[PDB]
């Protein structure tokens, strides 16, 4: 997990944060996803226990409880690929994708 991003396949665990300056995205224990100082919430308070935030291979943000049942979804989807949910410094959570270019400093060839 990045300090200010969530990639498709990663998880923002219960009471976990994404932060950029004063803007603090919290996946709360009351299953509500709130962007503090960003005037946004998923509005799913008390809808589950041990809730987690994930990002699908189609770029959809998903909140699921401990049992794995879906609580909330961003509905916006695109092609199968690699996506990134980024906390912008101007106070908004944005899903970007799919990836269009990669610099790889690991491959020897």
């Amino acid at each position: 997990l990045g300090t200010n991003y969530l990639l498709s396949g990663q998880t923002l665990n219960t009471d976990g944060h994404l932060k950029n300056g004063d803007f603090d995205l919290v996946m709360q224990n009351d299953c509500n996803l709130v962007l503090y100082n960003g005037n946004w919430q998923s509005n799913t308070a008390n809808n589950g226990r041990d809730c987690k935030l994930t990002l699908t291979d189609y770029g959809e943000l998903v909140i699921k409880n401990g049992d794995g049942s879906t609580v909330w979804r961003s509905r916006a989807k695109s092609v199968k690929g690699n996506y990134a949910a980024v906390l912008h410094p101007d106070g908004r959570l944005v899903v970007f994708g799919p990836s269009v270019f990669k610099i790889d400093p690991w491959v020897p060839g």
Binding site: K77, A84, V95, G97, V100
Partner: protein, 110 residues
């Protein structure tokens, strides 16, 4: 101008004169010698454009193309990536990869 974040470069932001992205022990530097260098991963990476122009800068556009331009706006290097008109982000990831993501498909605020 957009405020800077150490591991991100949004469309429209510019890096030049040894300005860089940093994440953990990784760095992506737009050096003063016109070379874009990734110091990280296992072997690193470079655009291989040392001395190819003067006072070069790096800029990600609103179509997902990452370009190095010299002082006279002559193209020195390009990612040659091109997609939908919109907002893009270059992330120097915690795992050392530098990846361009876009366009923006969902946001909390307009």
């Amino acid at each position: 101008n957009i405020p800077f974040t150490d591991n991100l470069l949004f469309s429209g932001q510019v890096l030049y004169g040894d300005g860089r992205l940093t994440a953990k022990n990784h760095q992506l530097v737009m050096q003063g010698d016109c070379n874009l260098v990734l110091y990280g991963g296992k072997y690193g990476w470079q655009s291989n454009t040392h001395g190819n122009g003067e006072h070069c800068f790096l800029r990600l556009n609103h179509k997902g193309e990452l370009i190095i331009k010299d002082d006279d706006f002559k193209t020195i290097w390009s990612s040659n990536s091109s997609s939908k008109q919109g907002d893009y982000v270059l992330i120097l990831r915690d795992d050392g990869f530098a990846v361009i993501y876009g366009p923006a498909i969902w946001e909390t605020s307009a």
